[PDB]
Symmetry: D3
Subunit: 291 residues, 6 copies
């Protein structure tokens, strides 16, 4: 129930105007029953310890709902990003990463941050660069320390539309459940960074050849029965699927599978505990009993 | 041929009645040509250095037979498990893990223990917790240090059957070969722990859609030749159960069957090459020695 | 453009006759935007620092072209291999590995060497054994420190024909592009060594069962509609299933990489209005990817 | 001025009766300009974040005053030790050490804790044993992870006096200054643990031989001057000092030297800024300008 | 009481004629309550687990007697050194060091080996070079992995005469106590290797100047009390040789004498407290057990 | 004879005007027979790899002459420091340190740099801070990676006059020998940083009390012999030595000891090989046979 770790930070930054500023940030790690802990970073002037603790607990239960092996975490830096230049924001992000890494609050097997509405992929790129340069230099998984990265930096295809299509799939099956698509795709990005290869790179051509061979088998089997028949032509949509086979297809399929499994589990929990239309309680009971 | 790393341990535990007891343990590592080593832990009063060394050699040859890239290992703690409570067994297991980890005899890349007849998944969970908490805390593969874990702790689906399913497949194809199936599944669990994902998590839905599209293609190609009446789309019943119930167990079973078939073929080829009629044990041992 | 790191080594070896010889070597790492670096090791008397730097730059651009996430590297040892025995070459290789690994120029996540014209799989076996025994002993990826290894040492199936198969695929699609196929396969070997399992080990039987079930469904539907036998795969499909191995997956991945990078080069050549100068298109593609 | 890091901990323990209990804890590191940080651990039910931060700042300034190269730190566990048996107190101490060492808040070159009024040498023994057993085994200086240990566990001779001897020396020379004897003795214990040898082990006999040779030289020169005399014999108190030469003599001499130097520096600062009798301001100015 | 760690090794070497040989080795660590462990290595064909365990226990108690913060250890390689060339011995020593280092049985903070009657400073140099080159490469204290090294390789001055000097001092004060001078000097060598400086390097000239100033003070005070008439400034002969030849061996000898004197006092105190007669062995063992 | 390792670096820096610049550097490591290597860094546009190799060899032989257990090393950065501001010079120094430390060319047990004529103690501060912040953070000896630091950063007293005092001592005893005082004092600074304490901190008061007790012994013995007499008061020079006992006294005494011993060894070598006034050949022969 309670957050087991909470770190309060105070670090100096050297402003462009020529003044020193003290920046205070927070990082709450809720549960270490599953490692690493997954969590976003919020660049807002209204952040507090209570908010990061609550969001870390929510993150833990959200990960438990969609069977993502992550603990809950939440960071927050008490700044207004619209009052700082890009250089100052880069300095703030890199020093925050340094302080978190020194205290064991960042790392591919410890604590993986993610972007937020106030942050973005540039901040994730800065975090990954800072970690790989200084602390995670001798780590082969150094770039798996953060998710939400750009494609050139190790990001995953299909991350921008992850939350919306997760919401769509959750609605189609029928907060803790509907808003979990981004968490699943961040888990997939973490896996892809650990794999050091994109999804389907070794599989696409092989599966294409196997499908064509199956269609040729149907061809020849129907030609043997009666003496012209062409059961080798794929449908139009199958042809676009074959031609445009990429990582986003695998990511979308994994997201849909995860959402379907979680919806079935929530339905079964709601039936077992004699709940009606109160799906929030069913999801929370499922997450609590999984943890 | 000989075991190259035998470790004898004497460690103290506190009893439930408030006494102190010295516990003796042994860990044998036969070969490090393949890393990590792999082997079980026996809680028995009849354990000895000779037994663990022989079982480590057997583990090496068994892993070589089924193409599992593990060295042979074997542990033994000279206790009778039916004389201690669950708390004392917890303490014994955690202290044994601590000593083995300090002496470099357990780890995801050096030595992976497994359960036994006198040992279960609770001991494996205790070992994994102890290692991931103290020595392997700053290691992303900390929970790959042991196999036979519960599902919630990182265990693999399809481990209970394993040995029996492997025995069935070995008989179907036609000790060092027939009894290796469980070992194979343990290997898979190790890989799963290094993957940080369950098998088929990113593949099941994609393959299901591809199969449905293939059936769509057959349907639309046949409806062009003759005539909507033709429906080469509905899967066969059992194929529908396979689609609906696709899980990690299916992949584990398929991998086990593939490994058993490959090993049986290799053993038959070795028995033919060296002119061994019905003594398949000699053929399997020759195959394992040649591989090692 | 310039090489980030150049390391020069002078190390001693004890010959069979009992004399002491000083061996010169040098490793160039061009770029570290992608980790690890990747490059070959050349045993020759005509090697120079300029040669290894140029080949490291070419290695970086070659990796960029075929979307291989490796930096460029290249090593050279100033010896004539036809002047030393097998024991002397083993000693030279192992000491070179020790010196390179002490200074951070060998490692699964740092810098991966590969064989060359004057080196082979037996040199890579020595490198991997030396690294896994001394410096990278407590490293689960110790054998991913080098590629071009034998099958028993963790090598990949399909390595021998990699360069020629890539050349054929590149010609079929239509130096930086055509000669990259082997590099791609080396990448796969690295991935295999990080996976601790061979490709298709857990997939072949499952895919075979799925294909047979699909053909069974075709039989069931056709027999219910109108018996007929659309379950038998064709002979080529039949020996594809029977002979399903890791080298099939390696070949398919090589073909996929070649086809994708050929499309990328064609698109780059069209956009910058380069009619038949595909070398410039490939270099522009690689530069803009880096 | 502000504390750099504050860590909040919630960890579970098993009671003797067999009931799970959540224990709250805090550790503040004020400054990391000097490494390692140094600070005590208080087992009290009235501990709070504000108190540990204030005491960490005070520890930083106290260490700066007596030229001890440590940063300020302070830990507090919100328990009443009078309500726990020795076994569960041991469990609490070991688990607190485990979490603090996991998140980089205990270490020979990171953070050294010390006993308090509510803690003692047994808690320090538990902390040292826990750290040496689990987190640092390949650390050759794991013994130096904590101070205030017993002699058999690597403690320093003269630790009991420490504070009183420093108070007496400070009064004789004429809070931030008078109460810093224990900090200096803990610094000496840390140095002794890093040295892996007790003070004077390789020096006492050599110094005794040198002193006797000097006395013999004076004797022989006097006998040669006038044709005997007995300068060989030391005085009573010098003979007791020679016979009873131990490590605590060196510790006492070092403490006296540190107190004298700090008193001289504080007097110089008070003269420079024209402070008559407000020695607290002079000491704080000295510490601030040192940091 | 029992040895808590025993490691058995079987490792291959290649001889000059090319034949492969399997070499057996043992290393027993008795007590880890005081780290690092400390013990010698014996090259003999009559080595066994029982002898190395007994000698490790003896080493623990001997270190406890002379207040040396080391646990007891003992190693043995089952070879006859008079049957191998220097190259073969170098290979055997280096491979033994590698196997011990991979399993955590040698290290500056883990376990420090020492020479013996069948082993010398040459094998110590080989061990130190092997450890500092492969496993302890990124360790600032890789020098302190072993003791008994040559002076140029990090050895201590006053090591050859250590045992005899300790025996003489023990007799002067009046096995576990009399034969412990080598252990004390090996402890001093370990400390010197950790310090990265020789004893007295930064102190000799300072003490010389202070000693010459004290005598000058006495001379000037006497010249003021009475009517350069008096010369107290000159030291006596033996003091002059002590000043001129001040080196590390003097400090080592003084430390050894201090340790032996303190241990003799403690043994006398123990023999008086428990009312023991002329049997000092029992008093020494009781003292060592009480300290442990 | 040859240098074992020569590293060539090309790294980018950002200028104040807003332009990227490529900076070339290189560090030669002569021999690893005595870890760590030791050598200075020259910020000069005329540096070449041949000069750094020659100076590394000279450093090896110079260290061998004065019994300093360091291998030779030498670094050079091809910039003219007069063309850069302090900010971009700090950036250059920090990035050079980063690149050198990533590939095992900076470290307390690997390779210790030192200042030069074109490089001062502020560059040493930058190097030490960069190393202790990024790669050597979990190293207890992180601040021993470099010498020539300021006193507040872990520098040694008596470092400024080291070369001149060594030259004077060498002349009084009678390049490879005369110019080795700075190397010895840098070795003492490395030892001081390893010890984590100043020289004489735990010794000065003890020696003072011992000297006063010896004078008391002489006084009492002479009073008991003939009937008073005052052979207790130290001389003027001894009184200032007692009052002003500092670490620089120990450093000066160690330097004098090293110079005297090296002069004796060079004289013995010159006699042994029948060399006359050619002491340079004697010093080189001594260094060669010591290595």
């Amino acid at each position: 129930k309670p957050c087991n770790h909470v770190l309060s930070l105070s670090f100096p930054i050297r402003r462009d105007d020529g003044s020193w500023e003290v920046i205070e940030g927070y990082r709450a790690q809720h549960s270490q029953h599953r490692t690493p802990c997954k969590g976003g970073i919020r660049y807002s002037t209204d952040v507090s310890v209570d908010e990061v603790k609550a969001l870390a607990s929510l993150m833990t239960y959200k990960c438990a709902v969609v069977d993502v092996p992550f603990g809950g975490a939440k960071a927050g830096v008490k700044i207004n990003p619209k009052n700082y230049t890009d250089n100052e924001l880069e300095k703030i992000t890199r020093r925050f990463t340094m302080e978190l890494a020194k205290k064991g609050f960042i790392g591919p097997g410890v604590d993986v941050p993610a972007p937020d509405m106030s942050t973005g992929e540039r901040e994730m790129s800065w975090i990954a660069d800072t970690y790989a340069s200084t602390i995670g230099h001798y780590d082969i998984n150094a770039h798996a320390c953060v998710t939400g990265k750009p494609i050139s930096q190790g990001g995953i295809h299909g991350r921008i539309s992850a939350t919306g299509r997760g919401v769509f799939h959750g609605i189609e099956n029928f907060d803790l459940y509907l808003n979990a698509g981004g968490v699943t795709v961040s888990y997939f990005e973490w896996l892809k960074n650990l794999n050091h290869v994109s999804y389907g790179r070794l599989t696409f051509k092989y599966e294409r050849d196997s499908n064509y061979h199956l269609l040729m088998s149907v061809q020849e089997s129907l030609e043997r029965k009666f003496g012209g028949t062409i059961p080798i032509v794929p449908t139009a949509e199958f042809q676009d699927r074959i031609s445009g086979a990429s990582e986003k297809d695998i990511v979308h399929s994994g997201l849909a599978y995860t959402m379907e499994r979680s919806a079935r589990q929530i339905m079964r929990t709601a039936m077992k505990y004699n709940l009606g239309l109160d799906l929030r309680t069913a999801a929370y009971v499922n997450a609590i009993e999984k943890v």
